[PDB]
Amino acid sequence: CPEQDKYRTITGMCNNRRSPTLGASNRAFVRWLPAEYEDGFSLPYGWTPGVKRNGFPVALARAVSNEIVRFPTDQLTPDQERSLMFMQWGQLLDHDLDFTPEPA
Amino acid sequence: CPEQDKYRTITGMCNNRRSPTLGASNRAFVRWLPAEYEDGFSLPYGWTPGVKRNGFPVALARAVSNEIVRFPTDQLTPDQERSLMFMQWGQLLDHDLDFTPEPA
Amino acid sequence: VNCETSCVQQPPCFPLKIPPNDPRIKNQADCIPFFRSCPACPGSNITIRNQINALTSFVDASMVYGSEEPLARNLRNMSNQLGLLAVNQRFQDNGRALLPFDNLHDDPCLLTNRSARIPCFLAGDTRSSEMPELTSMHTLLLREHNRLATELKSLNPRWDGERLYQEARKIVGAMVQIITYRDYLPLVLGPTAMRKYLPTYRSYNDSVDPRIANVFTNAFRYGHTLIQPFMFRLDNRYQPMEPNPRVPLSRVFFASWRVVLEGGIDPILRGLMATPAKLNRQNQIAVDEIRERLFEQVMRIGLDLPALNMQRSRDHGLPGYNAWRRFCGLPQPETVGQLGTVLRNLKLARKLMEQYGTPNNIDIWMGGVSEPLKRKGRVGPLLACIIGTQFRKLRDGDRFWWENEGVFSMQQRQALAQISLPRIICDNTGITTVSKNNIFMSNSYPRDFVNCSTLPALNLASWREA
Amino acid sequence: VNCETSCVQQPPCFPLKIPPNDPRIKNQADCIPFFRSCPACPGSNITIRNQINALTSFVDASMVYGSEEPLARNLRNMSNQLGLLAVNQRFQDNGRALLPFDNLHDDPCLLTNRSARIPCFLAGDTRSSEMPELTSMHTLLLREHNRLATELKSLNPRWDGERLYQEARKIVGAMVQIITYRDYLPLVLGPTAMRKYLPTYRSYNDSVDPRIANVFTNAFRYGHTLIQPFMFRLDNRYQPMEPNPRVPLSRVFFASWRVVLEGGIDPILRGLMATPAKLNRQNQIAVDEIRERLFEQVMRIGLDLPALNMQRSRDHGLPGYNAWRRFCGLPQPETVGQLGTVLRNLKLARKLMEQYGTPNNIDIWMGGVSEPLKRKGRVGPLLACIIGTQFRKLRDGDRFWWENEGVFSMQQRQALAQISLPRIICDNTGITTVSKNNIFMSNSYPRDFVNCSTLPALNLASWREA
Ligand SMILES: *[C@@H]1O[C@H](CO[C@@H]2O[C@@H](C)[C@@H](O)[C@@H](O)[C@@H]2O)[C@@H](O[C@@H]2O[C@H](CO)[C@@H](O[C@@H]3O[C@H](CO[C@H]4O[C@H](CO)[C@@H](O)[C@H](O)[C@@H]4O)[C@@H](O)[C@H](O[C@H]4O[C@H](CO)[C@@H](O)[C@H](O)[C@@H]4O)[C@@H]3O)[C@H](O)[C@H]2NC(C)=O)[C@H](O)[C@H]1NC(C)=O
Ligand SMILES: *[C@@H]1O[C@H](CO[C@@H]2O[C@@H](C)[C@@H](O)[C@@H](O)[C@@H]2O)[C@@H](O[C@@H]2O[C@H](CO)[C@@H](O[C@@H]3O[C@H](CO[C@H]4O[C@H](CO)[C@@H](O)[C@H](O)[C@@H]4O)[C@@H](O)[C@H](O[C@H]4O[C@H](CO)[C@@H](O)[C@H](O)[C@@H]4O)[C@@H]3O)[C@H](O)[C@H]2NC(C)=O)[C@H](O)[C@H]1NC(C)=O
Ligand code: HEM
Ligand code: HEM
Ligand SMILES: *[C@@H]1O[C@H](CO)[C@@H](O)[C@H](O)[C@H]1NC(C)=O
Ligand SMILES: *[C@@H]1O[C@H](CO)[C@@H](O)[C@H](O)[C@H]1NC(C)=O
Ligand SMILES: *[C@@H]1O[C@H](CO)[C@@H](O)[C@H](O)[C@H]1NC(C)=O
Ligand SMILES: *[C@@H]1O[C@H](CO)[C@@H](O)[C@H](O)[C@H]1NC(C)=O
Ligand SMILES: [C-]#N
Ligand SMILES: [C-]#N
Ligand SMILES: [Br-]
Ligand SMILES: [Br-]
Ligand SMILES: [Br-]
Ligand SMILES: [Br-]
Ligand SMILES: [Br-]
Ligand SMILES: [Br-]
Ligand SMILES: [Br-]
Ligand SMILES: [Br-]
Ligand SMILES: [Ca+2]
Ligand SMILES: [Ca+2]
């Protein structure tokens, strides 16, 4: 990595001198906790019919959404102390921090 | 992983149930600190001629061994409080813990 | 294959299965489209599958400039030595710049209004067109970049294109960091979590890991609970922009034609300032515009964003609720009664348990947004821990943090401390009335608003090369 | 490129270069052979290269039973229902079993003595024949397994082979854990490091990651400093076993023929017991038998173990001395004066500064073995931190830890707490005189020895199924 520099690289490369890929683009996320897969290394919970997670059936994401998340739109409560800009900056900021690619 | 077992698997798989490969054989070591490679992801320090580490020339491993490790055997100090079995259990125990494959 | 046209569960697809008696997808065998995130080490039978961040983790406005070199150069106006970002060569917004059009394969934006024929926008990040309000924020920072470069050029005539681009890019990056840590994060976390996870900055620490953590990509989706079911548009006097001031969200996703043909970014920016966010409440988590009708116009059926969040966490092999509570040093409820205590809501806890059986299996997003919000914050303890922990590592582990010694001068830092989102809007739009500080709190016109004229411009004096 | 026969640096070879005025290799065109450790994700332009653990991290005697199912089954006697491990079919050691011979292609053991034609031994781990003293420990444990299976067969007749194998392997496993944490580790770490890194066991915690850390594979090589330049063999009255009581280590590596043809494992075990280990001193770090003549007879050139350890830590991308000190919460010396203070040895710090330029670049093994030893310990603060942290994880994160509730009965744990290496030696050898506990401290005959007849055998009565 360059002796001295005035500006960040575009890829984030060399921000950290000792480990120049940290925070750089096109690198694996860091794991704060070991991953939990059906087979221990790759298949997601919910992939194999009849495979329980820690003693219980895997709840359909859509079932959870329907039973816990769904609510009557006319019950929506406006946040008296937050603007919709609070919502939008979060999304804009999210787009500065992470994008998880998938095959097209 | 079997809902119930009786003994260790030979590979260590399923010792941890939430994360089944932890401690199991033929898996990547965990990183307690982010790796430090010459190019940031794969080349070892000392691989590319003229390329320094943290501002300084990489010392030849053999050179460090010659200058710091080498000593006249006649100066050897017998450990009055340890048996050679202290060394040997160590090696035996290491061989219960890790083996890092290399190509033949 | 195609994860979008079939329900076949084969690589790289992981379609969401439909529960019996669904209120919308009556066909129990149908599904909601889902592509697994690209694995860091394709097809390995040794590695534990992990996912990839395509972006720079740093708060460096890479959503403006890009995180890959081909793109970064393609985003820049290389026709002169003005150091500008390229702007749309087909349309302007009342004389002001719009983002240049992108060139995708089957452009999703084309599909939102077939006759309008307006493609998606090209930006530092591929999602700039996902909703017009996000598009307007992207355009705002593109204008600020070109403004800054123009000013710096009057300031320092000898400065070439590369220098001007880099200097303006550095100021924009500083602006995002300041608005984020000074104005935004304190309102997310609440004062108590702010003090715990974000103590006073001391200096850059090269031993702080700055990478985004896998769980963060799912936990920061707490924001989905803030989304209103409409895109609100207001005219110059902050009144409803007729004939359509409230557009259902299911008809604005990837709707770039609305920025180009329906009045530009000003009506959209006023809507964001003068309308409240949706408040997250335990029996009012997320709206059907994103739960039933997500991407309605560009998909075979409407998606479910909350459900997608949960399937993604599984795709990513993320531990459950209690494992994350433990990671954060928070008590781990093991029974319904204990969960009822933590959530301050036994009914919700009962609901959670009927679906998951154990609090250990609740998906991180679901458990995270279920928790009661911290005082003057908009997330509970678990999300506070995860979000606050991530942003500290992004500040502390950034060699280019705006306050780090050697990045900017003292005089430059003092000038940058005066920046605000409301003034930036004043600098790059036809809006002359903006929100009072803090912009993320203010939400009521005219009470929370003041004239742009009462806000001092950014003082660039200290960027003058002597 | 052939890493054994060529000094060309191309994948997968990383040959150690020879410095000027080398005391042994005068030709700088030469090198010390080195094969890069296999990458977890080969040829990836995404992942940060990592290395592979081929073994179970758990202290489960995998070096006896194997870490892969094919081997594990091939190591077992499958001709009857006794649950035994297969023993050597061509040789015995005074009416006792030897390890079966392995079938290696270019078998290094055969090269240590061409006419004897004794091949390497087959065991749970591939290195059992590396030195005769290790082979003796592998043979001793294999014997204990078959003794246990026999007794258990008289105790519980209905128990098939599989039950006997597994119950025997489970006792052996506890034996390795008990000897390691009760006798060995406290003498590695010393009292203060023991209490700090290994508090009293409570029970199994499944949130404790039991994986071996990459740094451990290099830090635990601390043991290389305890190695004596000879293999010492003593007869029944513990006197020099003529004609060759002190054999140069450069002529014992992979010398399996010596176990088979030169007295078996009794002369070797008595040698480990009644000979002091070498002490690590800052000016007497590691002997030339391993620094100059490592594996001489079984390849083109003698290797240098200390040098291989430093080349290995770079191969593995391991952080330098100060990064590890910081990870451990230890002060980080930045000047030669600071380093001298930490090392309590200015002369050594100067040598280190002169080699590395900065303490930040000191390779982890070098810096680790350079630190002064903790009181009643044989490593300094850094290695104590690294080794103590690893072992706590191996204990607390192991579902089958011998002391975890449910693994053994309260009566079975009482019986196991009475085991010791000396008693195991008495049960599987012709040696009737053994070291007084602690076997890792005792090293002087007759002062530190007692008769086998004075030691209580393991009571398997609580293993009765009835
Ligand atoms: C079961 O074991 C779990 C693992 O325990 C560790 O390993 C074993 C072998 C022991 O040595 C043990 O001492 C080790 O801790 C254990 O869970 C662990 O519990 C601790 C304490 O609650 C957790 O620490 C907290 O971490 C959060 C998150 O930050 C951490 O992760 C980030 C990202 O990697 C790092 O950058 C941080 O430095 C942390 O490592 C912190 O926010 C939190 O600190 C804050 O709160 C405390 C309390 O006020 C303050 O002191 C701090 O200043 C902060 O304000 C803690 O540091 C740890 O993450 C967690 N690990 C796991 C895997 O869950 C569990 O408790 C054990 N259970 C039992 C019954 O033994
Ligand atoms: C620069 O930042 C460095 C990283 O700091 C972390 O992240 C920042 C953003 C903050 O959140 C900060 O609070 C975080 O710590 C920082 O280096 C770090 O310093 C800490 C404190 O000394 C180190 O913690 C110690 O770790 C060792 C090793 O064990 C750790 O790792 C294992 C394996 O992953 C875990 O299982 C353990 O739970 C630990 O996490 C421990 O031995 C030690 O604890 C022992 O000693 C203390 C005191 O005697 C006792 O309280 C304990 O009971 C133990 O006996 C600490 O837990 C941390 O490893 C280290 N991280 C890195 C990357 O080096 C550095 O100090 C900062 N510098 C400045 C100038 O700010
Ligand atoms: C206009 C508002 C928003 C959307 C429309 C929207 C949509 C999504 C979608 C479709 C995903 C991916 C779903 C999947 O896993 O298949 C998604 C991911 C993420 N979001 Fe979304 N989002 C809108 C708004 C927000 C806000 C306000 C956020 C934060 C305050 C927010 C965050 C996130 C994050 C962090 C992700 C993951 C991104 C990645 O790929 O790494 N979103 N959102
Ligand atoms: C007879 C005594 C010992 C040896 C002979 C010996 C030799 C080595 C060699 C050749 C390696 C690999 C070097 C390289 O990186 O190229 C090696 C690795 C390890 N050792 Fe060694 N060792 C002898 C003795 C010990 C003792 C007493 C140890 C510990 C107390 C010890 C440890 C280790 C460890 C942990 C490794 C790494 C193993 C792996 O592949 O992961 N050794 N040793
Ligand atoms: C580049 O800049 C000039 C002057 O500002 C402008 O006229 C031109 O349209 C720009 N080119 C692009 C592609 O934006
Ligand atoms: C689509 O865009 C056209 C302009 O091309 C506009 O007239 C029309 O109102 C839009 N259609 C819809 C359904 O809004
Ligand atoms: C298996 O055990 C029987 C009886 O102990 C013995 O005859 C035979 O040698 C053993 N087989 C092997 C391969 O060790
Ligand atoms: C090799 O072993 C044979 C016995 O098979 C023995 O005569 C000879 O001494 C050994 N060779 C060496 C070099 O020690
Ligand atoms: C939202 N992304
Ligand atoms: C040593 N192995
Ligand atoms: Br994670
Ligand atoms: Br490591
Ligand atoms: Br364009
Ligand atoms: Br999107
Ligand atoms: Br206005
Ligand atoms: Br045999
Ligand atoms: Br070896
Ligand atoms: Br004897
Ligand atoms: Ca970024
Ligand atoms: Ca093992």
Question: What one-character DSSP code corresponds to residue B100?
Answer: -
Pocket of ligand 4 (CB under 6 A): B 87, 90-91, 94, 98-100; D 130-131, 217, 220-221, 223-224, 227, 253, 305, 308-309, 312
Residue C169: strand, helix, or coil: helix
Pocket of ligand 3 (CB under 6 A): A 87, 90-91, 94, 98-100; C 130-131, 134, 217, 220-221, 223-224, 226-227, 253, 305, 308, 312
Torsions phi, psi of A4, nearest 5? -135, 145
In angstroms, the CA D62 to CA D77 distance is: 17
Q: Among all chains, which residue has been given the structure tokens 């939990």?
A: A36
Give how far Cα D437 sits from Cα of C230, D164, D441, D442, Å: 78, 30, 8, 7
Distance of CA D200 to the CA centre of its chain: 25
N- to C-terminal Cα separation, chain D: 62
> For residue A76, which of B57, C284, D101 has the smallest C-alpha distance?
C284
Establish whether B95 is a catalytic residue: yes
b/e sequence C154-181, b meaning 16+ C-beta within 10 Å: ebbeebebebbbbbbbbbbbbbbbbbbb
Give the bridge partners for D284, in sequence order.
D281
**Is D398 exposed, middle or buried, given 0-12, 13-18 or 19+ CB atoms closer than 10 A?**
buried
Cβ neighbours for C334, distance < 8 A, ≥ 6 positions apart: C322, C358, C359, C360
In angstroms, the CA D435 to CA D422 distance is: 6
- Angle, alpha carbons C273-C276-C279 (nearest 5°): 145
Which tokens sit at B76?
């050897």
Give how far Cα B46 sits from Cα of B41, B52, C456, D326, D360, Å: 14, 8, 54, 24, 15
CB C307 within 8 A of CB A61: yes
One-character DSSP codes across B1-66: --SS-SS--SS-TTSSSSSTTTT-SSEEPB-SS----TTSSSPPTTSSTT--BTTBPPPPHHHHII
CB D332 within 8 A of CB D41: no
Q: Point out the ligand nearest to the CA of residue C251.
A: 6
CB D48 within 8 A of CB B38: no
Domain boundaries, chain B: 1-104
Interface test with C, best of A5, A48, A86 (most C CBs within 10 A): A86
H-run or E-run covering B78: strand B78-83
Q: Among all chains, which residue has been given the structure tokens 């800052």?
A: D282
Q: Which residue, by CA, sits nearest to atom 8 of ligand 4?
A: D305
Which tokens sit at A47?
């992939």
**CA closest to B25 among chain C residues:** C46
Torsions phi, psi of D58, nearest 5? -60, 150
In angstroms, the CA D272 to CA D258 distance is: 16
On chain D, the residues whose CB falls within 8 A of the CB of C51 are: none
Question: What one-character DSSP code corresponds to residue C251?
Answer: G
CB atoms within 10 A of CB B75: 9
Strands C16-17 and C31-32: antiparallel
DSSP collapsed to 3 states, chain D: CCCCCCCCCCCCECCEECCCCCCCCCCCCCEECCECCCECCCCCCCCCCCEEECCCCCCCCHHHHCCCHHHHHHCECCCCCCCCECCCCCCECCCCECCCECCCCCCHHHHCCCCCCCCCECCCCCCCCCCHHHHHHHHHHHHHHHHHHHHHHHHCCCCCHHHHHHHHHHHHHHHHHHHHHHHHHHHHHHHHHHHHHCCCCCCCCCCCCCCCECCHHHHHHHHHHCCCCEEECECCCCCECCCCCEEEHHHCCCCCHHHHHCCCCHHHHHHHHCCEEECCECCECCCHHHHCCECHHHCCCCECHHHHHHHHHHHCCCCCHHHHHHHCCCCCCCCHHHHHHHHCCHHHHHHHHHHHCCHHHCCHHHHHHHCCCCCCCCCCHHHHHHHHHHHHHHHHCCCCCCCCECCECHHHHHHHCCCCHHHHHHHHCCCCEEECCCCCCCCCCCCCEEEHHHCCCCCCHHHCCC
> For residue B100, which of C335, D213, C181, C298 has the smallest C-alpha distance?
D213
In angstroms, the CA C50 to CA D48 distance is: 12
In angstroms, the CA C364 to CA C367 distance is: 5
Interface test with B, best of D324, D355, D365, D390 (most B CBs within 10 A): D355
Give how far Cα D403 sits from Cα of D200, D287, D414, D416, Å: 11, 39, 10, 10
N- to C-terminal Cα separation, chain B: 34
Q: Among all chains, which residue has been given the structure tokens 């006419």?
A: D115
Q: Tell me which of A84, A95, A99, A103 is the catalytic residue.
A: A95
Which tokens sit at C178?
């300041």
CB C256 within 8 A of CB C268: no
Which tokens sit at D24?
């042994």
CB C52 within 8 A of CB C205: no
- Angle, alpha carbons D54-D59-D60 (nearest 5°): 85
Interface test with A, best of D48, D316, D364 (most A CBs within 10 A): D48
Distance of CA D369 to the CA centre of its chain: 17
Give the bridge partners for D247, in sequence order.
D231
* A8 CA distance to ligand 12 middle (Å): 28
CB C75 within 8 A of CB C85: yes
User: Which of C46, C209, C319 lies nearest to residue B34, judging by beta carbons?
Assistant: C209
Q: Which residue, by CA, sits nearest to atom 1 of ligand 10?
A: B91
Residue C374: strand, helix, or coil: coil
Which tokens sit at C252?
């604005």
DSSP collapsed to 3 states, C113-131: CCCCCCCCECCCCCCCCCC
Q: Which residues surround ligand 15, an ion (CB under 5 A)?
A: C 236, 431-433
Question: What one-character DSSP code corresponds to residue C456?
Answer: P
Residue A7: strand, helix, or coil: coil
> For residue B26, which of D214, C45, A42 has the smallest C-alpha distance?
C45
Sign of CA dihedral D61, D63, D65, D68: positive
* D218 CA distance to ligand 4 middle (Å): 9
In angstroms, the CA D105 to CA B82 distance is: 38
One-character DSSP codes across C35-94: BPPPBSSTT-SSSPP-BEE-S-SSSS-HHHH-SSHHHHHHHEETTSSS-EEP--SS--BT
In angstroms, the CA C253 to CA C133 distance is: 10
Strands D16-17 and D31-32: antiparallel
In angstroms, the CA A23 to CA A11 distance is: 9
Breaks (C-N over 2.5 A) in chain D follow: none
Q: Is the CB of B77 under 6 A from ligand 10?
A: no
> For residue C214, which of D117, D211, A97 has the smallest C-alpha distance?
A97
In angstroms, the CA D159 to CA D465 distance is: 9
Bin C263: left if φ > 0, else alpha if -120 < ψ < 50, else beta: left
Q: Tell me which of B75, B85, B95, B98 is the catalytic residue.
A: B95
* C115 CA distance to ligand 6 middle (Å): 7
> For residue C64, which of C179, C183, C222, C170 has the smallest C-alpha distance?
C170
> For residue C85, which of C68, C72, C69 has the smallest C-alpha distance?
C72
CB D388 within 8 A of CB D144: no
Give how far Cα C414 sits from Cα of A29, C417, D367, Å: 35, 5, 44
User: Which of B18, B26, B34 lies nearest to residue C46, judging by beta carbons?
Assistant: B26
Long-range contacts of C337-343 (CB under 8 A, 24+ apart): C342/C371, C343/C282, C343/C370, C343/C371, C343/C372
CA dihedral D151→D155→D156→D162, nearest 10 degrees, is -10
CB C194 within 8 A of CB C185: yes
In angstroms, the CA D56 to CA D64 distance is: 12
Sign of CA dihedral D295, D296, D298, D299: positive
Torsions phi, psi of D151, nearest 5? -60, -45
Q: CB–CB of B54 and A19 under 8 A?
A: no
Bin D317: left if φ > 0, else alpha if -120 < ψ < 50, else beta: left
Tell me the residues of chain A between 14 and 73 that have a Cβ less than 8 Å away from chain C. 15-18, 22-37, 40-42, 44-47, 53-71, 73
Torsions phi, psi of D405, nearest 5? -55, 140
> For residue C122, which of C107, C424, C114 has the smallest C-alpha distance?
C107
Question: What one-character DSSP code corresponds to residue A75?
Answer: G
Which ligand 2 atom sits nearest the alpha carbon of residue D196? 55
Strands C84-85 and C76-77: antiparallel
In angstroms, the CA D355 to CA B65 distance is: 10
Alpha helix ranges (H) inside chain A? 61-64, 84-97
CB D143 within 8 A of CB D97: yes
Angle between helices A84-97 and C266-274 (to 10 degrees): 110
Q: Among all chains, which residue has been given the structure tokens 């250990």?
A: C360
Bin D455: left if φ > 0, else alpha if -120 < ψ < 50, else beta: beta
Map out the domains of chain C with their CATH numbers. Answer: 1-466 (1.10.640.10)
Which amino acid does the sequence have at C382?
Answer: L
> For residue D460, which of D403, D404, D416 has the smallest C-alpha distance?
D416
- Angle, alpha carbons D161-D123-D440 (nearest 5°): 105
CB D224 within 8 A of CB D278: no
Residue C25: strand, helix, or coil: coil
Where do the DSSP E strands lie in C234-362?
Answer: 246-248, 276-278
CA distance A21 to chain D (A): 8
CB D176 within 8 A of CB D60: yes
Which amino acid does the sequence have at B83?
Answer: S
H-run or E-run covering C31: strand C31-32
> For residue C56, which of A101, A28, A25, A10 has the smallest C-alpha distance?
A25
In angstroms, the CA C114 to CA C254 distance is: 12
Give the bridge partners for D16, in sequence order.
D32
Q: How many CA atoms lie within 13 A of C264 on its CB side?
A: 18
> For residue C184, which of C220, C139, C230 has the smallest C-alpha distance?
C220
One-character DSSP codes across C407-450: TB-HHHHHHHTT--HHHHHHHHSS--EEEPSPTTT---TTTTEE
In angstroms, the CA A79 to CA A100 distance is: 30
Give how far Cα C423 sits from Cα of A37, C64, C141, C175, C436, Å: 48, 19, 12, 11, 10
Which ligand 3 atom sits nearest the alpha carbon of residue C34? 16
Angle between helices C266-274 and C132-155 (to 10 degrees): 110
In angstroms, the CA C368 to CA C360 distance is: 13
Which tokens sit at D466?
């009835």
Cis link prior to B78 (omega < 30° from 0)? no
Give the bridge partners for C433, in sequence order.
C451
Q: Among all chains, which residue has been given the structure tokens 């984020």?
A: C180
In angstroms, the CA D338 to CA D346 distance is: 9
CB C339 within 8 A of CB C353: yes
Distance of CA A103 to the CA centre of its chain: 17
In angstroms, the CA D88 to CA C259 distance is: 82
User: Which of C46, C47, C207 lies nearest to residue D326, judging by beta carbons?
Assistant: C207
b/e sequence D341-375, b meaning 16+ C-beta within 10 Å: ebbebeebbebbbebbbbbbbbbbbbbbbbbbbbe
CB-based contact, B4 to chain D, within 8 Å: no
In angstroms, the CA A50 to CA A11 distance is: 43
CB D166 within 8 A of CB B6: yes
Residue C215: strand, helix, or coil: helix
- Binding positions of D for heme b are 130-131, 224
CB A7 within 8 A of CB C170: yes
Alpha helix ranges (H) inside C205-335? 214-219, 257-261, 266-274, 288-291, 305-315, 321-327
CB atoms within 10 A of CB C84: 24
CB B93 within 8 A of CB D58: no
In angstroms, the CA C253 to CA C298 distance is: 8
